[model samples]
Target: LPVPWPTLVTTFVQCFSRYPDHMKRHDFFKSAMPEGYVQERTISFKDDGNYKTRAEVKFEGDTLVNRIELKGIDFKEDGNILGHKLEYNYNSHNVYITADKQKNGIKANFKIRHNIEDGSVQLADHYQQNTPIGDGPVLLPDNHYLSTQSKLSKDPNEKRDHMVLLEFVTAAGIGTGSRHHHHHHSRKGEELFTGVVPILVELDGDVNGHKFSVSGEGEGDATYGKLTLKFICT
Candidate 1:
């Protein structure tokens, strides 16, 4: 059955699709950085914007993650050997994701928007938990479902849990199936016409080692291009 266009569907499914796990490996340390000082000079953390002096943090999934990131630092010596001054740049990003008593989830925040020509996707983050990004769904639903697949552990037990810049256009096309007249498609019962895109994925997640699985699936339209996703978490 063909789902209507511009519809919004959110069903967590356990399907066996041909698309592999889209395997992506990311390592998060979950700890603060600049542990001591720089060059034996008592250094400190930057407590502004995305800089956190402390290592511990909290997210929406019962996570006590300790992700530390500090940069643009200048330390001072107790007493200069010759009273010299040199301007240098020192930056650090320490990450740790060990749950205290429950499985922890990635403390990442992002946003997704939908439109015909000017649909934009920007990942605004104040916490250094920004991860990879997928191509926004254009007026199609099946493409969105393909991006929602998550490998959630069924053991009912697990535990876990970057900054970067991205400014590119994901020129998309509604993949009207080769077996139908898709040029004159209707708009209803779908996730593209009204703005229902998967904001993110189940990549960064864990809760006290008990929160398991992050998979979802739904169907929509014709998409016959490379759905490229870049994985870079710093």
Candidate 2:
């Protein structure tokens, strides 16, 4: 059996609707948009005329693409810098999107343009809750375990029922900082060497002990890198 092109496109775009709920739990991609809903951003300033942000999307099965970019603006006299960008692509059945920005003294400024019409709005407001499978602690990558421990409530009629204590722990160190750099300084015929702070850490937390995890990575001392562990909470 052969599927029509329009039917295939519609079905493919509808698949994106499932991401809305999943994305809500995360801080990234705060903009809530309908699946296949095309949008853009723009900017103009400092002797510049109508230099707006650009976005393009093609939802065909093959060669499907979406992108948004902002940069190269005449900000000030001899100040030609900018910020914010997007790079996204779709291949086979996998989708990848990345957001980036420049490191300069400039506040982020942009606007979005929504082009919603016909099939584009097919899955804009459609939402459904998908339940998770199984009923045990979920293990994470790099050997981590997360689960609930206890439940207790003070008042029964306060609309705040009992609560469960969250437990988490890490088994081993995940990707510590093990890199080094060297430099030389001229000081009365002497040589100098410098390196980053050494760190090594593991993540673990108990019901009432507080929250803890691998906080950061630092330069390695000899054979192992430095890892930071933090376990503090209110």
Candidate 3:
């Protein structure tokens, strides 16, 4: 049966709403660093911007997402080179889905778009989440369920809940399959589009913890979007 485009969209949004209590516990730690301070022997300036920010975020079925950035604007606060209203734009995205591993149950896809105002630099990134799954329908109805499994990561010397694990099913198929997968703790289902950091997955190689964008690919246009994880670095 053909899934109603509108219904599929609406259902996706509603399916992720079950995590109200799950998100509330870690709402305070959401943030994005656009113009951060960079210090090099007392010569500190805004270090351009931080990569891996999302425009939308959700959790449903077997996926637990914290941020989903589609577009971004990067400006040099030091005022070194610029002659227009918008200095530069840096866009990216990240979609976390459930995989086949216990600690590696999530998959991520990333895309990058670099377009400057004065034509100094312009580039587009078509990246894909390097996981194992078939690219099926783009839109899926809210047939899958989701939840949160949190852990108290208190410093050996300090007592606090510093870690959270969110889980949801990766929806397949388009239209009715493209569930919204929203977070209830987002102030009645509202969240910071490009200013927040998700938790991390413990990798094997390095001891460095993983955050949302920090540990996955941030791409755009889930439906009909291309897969090319290539971009320029700072």
Evaluated with lDDT, which candidate comes out highest? 3
The lDDT-based order of candidates, best leading, equals: 3, 2, 1
RMSD to native for every prediction? 21.5, 24.8, 18.7
The alpha-carbon deviation from the true structure for residue 163 of candidate 2, after best TM-score superposition, in angstroms, is 46
Question: Candidate 2: deviation at residue 30, Å?
Answer: 14
lDDT of 3 by residue, 2-38 (tens): 1111111100111222223223322211111111111
Worst 10 residues of 3 by lDDT: 3-12
Q: Local error of candidate 3 at 150, Å?
A: 33
Query: By TM-score, highest first, what's the ranking?
Result: 3, 2, 1
User: What TM-score does each of the candidates earn?
Assistant: 0.16, 0.19, 0.21
lDDT of 2 by residue, 1-234 (tens): 011111111111111111111121211111111112233333333232222333332222322233333222333222211111111111112122222222110112222221222212111111111111223221111221111111111233534212111111111221232112212212210101022222221222221122222122122211111111211111
C-alpha lDDT of all candidate models, in order: 0.19, 0.20, 0.23
In the predicted model 2, the residue pairs found to clash are 42-53, 199-226, 199-227, 200-227
Between candidates 1 and 3, which one is better according to TM-score? 3
Residue 102 of model 3, lDDT score: 27
Clashing residue pairs in all predictions, respectively, total: 34, 4, 42
> Which stretches of candidate 2 lie above 4 Å from their native place?
1-35, 43-51, 67-73, 80-234
